[PDB]
Write a protein that binds this ligand. Structure first.
Ligand SMILES: Cc1cc2nc3c(=O)[nH]c(=O)nc-3n(C[C@H](O)[C@H](O)[C@H](O)COP(=O)(O)OP(=O)(O)OC[C@H]3O[C@@H](n4cnc5c(N)ncnc54)[C@H](O)[C@@H]3O)c2cc1C
Ligand SMILES: Cc1cc2nc3c(=O)[nH]c(=O)nc-3n(C[C@H](O)[C@H](O)[C@H](O)COP(=O)(O)OP(=O)(O)OC[C@H]3O[C@@H](n4cnc5c(N)ncnc54)[C@H](O)[C@@H]3O)c2cc1C
Ligand SMILES: COc1ccc2[nH]cc(CCNC(C)=O)c2c1
Ligand SMILES: COc1ccc2[nH]cc(CCNC(C)=O)c2c1
Ligand SMILES: [Zn+2]
Ligand SMILES: [Zn+2]
Lengths: 230, 230
């Protein structure tokens, strides 16, 4: 038995609604007997910028810096910065990776975009021919637990923001599926700032309730059809 | 001429293809007599993280930190960190804002995502109400000049990556249109790393050539249909 879960958390305030969702996930998964690790990006002051400091020692081409090539070579030569490799070890061992974050401009907050940019490097998360279905992190599950400022109605086909699946494409398909992750249906907690205490306590309970059978869930068919089709 | 242009540039290497696209933009707009400013994010070591350090005055709610609320109030009070206000001044004066960057996970590099998260704050870029066609940056034009690793064929409805327009949604609609920007058609320079010299020079000249008549262009209809069709 036993499963390992990594929660990559991106919120500045422990008392926030995101903080409560993160804490409920830790509590429930821990109660189930799961091995749980949390990467609290803001508390770690995680570096988001992709720079040459991500490679220790000497570059393979110090004349013209190419981040993708340098990190690919550094990964193979075990020469990546320790913050990056500390994260890859957590991801390598994880059976499920949960990303907990507030939607920032239809996407992840920059600190979490930086985690994706620097941690999921070529050789570790993908390569030729390991991508999408054959991505290097195949066999692992991933799930986006997002909170929004806009209401559910706003995120409908005819709402101003359009369908939620529209902004999910770059994250779910372009990133998670690309690295070989089987993607579980997103958990979207719509406009918690607006909601009442009851509705709030209700979205948290739904999440805690869903986590009870998380290992029984089937991955979504990560296709353009799923995100855009009828 | 008679126009102000801000180029927000996100690439670590001056000698890169992105660097050349940024340089030809400066050269061509400068030749036209336009006023040009470049925010070279990596050279500026631009801070991507949205933290409480972005507000220098008394917080409105020091018990529970809410970045959106605190930055909205700090904007009105003029207590935002100076790096944010320096960027807001550049955007305020610009008639056209060009974003020059390599696609990272179907989106902008984290350093540029941080610029969007921190610079486009409530009160400055939008207000509630006061977004989309009523956004605060209405009247201004925006354009994404993106480079990719994947080829144009990969970026089609039947390609592995799906149509390129799918990944532009969060950026063009969720961010730029949301703030009131008119969005000009994206400049996408496909897979310059695997292209031949003839092809690269060609992509650079195509961009330079396009800039010659940029002021005569009409914005795209930034809608779900334009992005997803059907
Ligand atoms: C830079 C930036 C860009 C943004 N862009 C977007 C965007 O693209 N689209 C969009 O829709 N939104 C956007 N937003 C809004 C953002 O997504 C929401 O503000 C965020 O998701 C709200 O989540 P939170 O955890 O911060 O809420 P909080 O304010 O922390 O919490 C909401 C309420 O829940 C209470 N609460 C906390 N825990 C519990 C609990 N266990 N039970 C009951 N109540 C609890 C809190 O105390 C509070 O009153 C953006 C915000 C910023 C700052
Ligand atoms: C973290 C990360 C995530 C990524 N995710 C994605 C993704 O989601 N999807 C995707 O498609 N790609 C992705 N990529 C790939 C990335 O988008 C490309 O590597 C990038 O767009 C290439 O641009 P460049 O400026 O770095 O090219 P360069 O490495 O500079 O290559 C272009 C070539 O052109 C030459 N050149 C420069 N200027 C000129 C000139 N004036 N005339 C002629 N030739 C010139 C250069 O010397 C070089 O050999 C990712 C890369 C990283 C590092
Ligand atoms: C090096 O870093 C990355 C990271 C994530 C990525 N997604 C897609 C690409 C490029 C794909 N290129 C080709 C020619 O197949 C990519 C590169
Ligand atoms: C969709 O774009 C954004 C961008 C920055 C934002 N800050 C706060 C909010 C939530 C307020 N209501 C809306 C319009 O969702 C927000 C939304
Ligand atoms: Zn997919
Ligand atoms: Zn739009």
């Amino acid at each position: 038995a036993g499963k390992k879960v990594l929660i990559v958390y991106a919120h500045q305030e422990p008392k926030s609604f995101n903080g409560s969702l993160k804490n409920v996930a830790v509590d429930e998964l821990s109660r189930q007997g799961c091995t749980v690790t949390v990467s609290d990006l803001y508390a770690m002051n995680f570096e988001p910028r992709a720079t040459d400091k991500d490679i220790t020692g000497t570059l393979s081409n110090p004349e013209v810096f190419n981040y993708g090539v340098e990190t690919h070579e550094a990964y193979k030569q075990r020469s990546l910065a320790s913050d990056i490799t500390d994260e890859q070890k957590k991801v390598r061992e994880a059976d499920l990776v949960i990303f907990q974050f507030p939607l920032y401009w239809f996407s992840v907050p920059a600190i979490l975009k930086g985690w994706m940019d620097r941690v999921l490097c070529q050789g570790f998360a993908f390569d030729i021919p390991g991508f999408y279905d054959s991505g290097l992190l195949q066999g692992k599950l991933a799930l986006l637990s997002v909170t929004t400022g806009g209401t559910a109605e706003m995120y409908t086909k005819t709402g101003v923001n359009g369908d939620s699946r529209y902004f999910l494409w770059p994250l779910q398909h372009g990133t998670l599926h690309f690295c070989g992750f089987k993607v579980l249906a997103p958990q979207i907690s719509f406009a918690p700032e607006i909601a009442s205490e009851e509705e709030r306590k209700g979205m948290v309970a739904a999440w805690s309730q869903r986590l009870q059978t998380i290992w029984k869930e089937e991955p979504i068919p990560c296709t353009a059809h799923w995100h855009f089709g009828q």
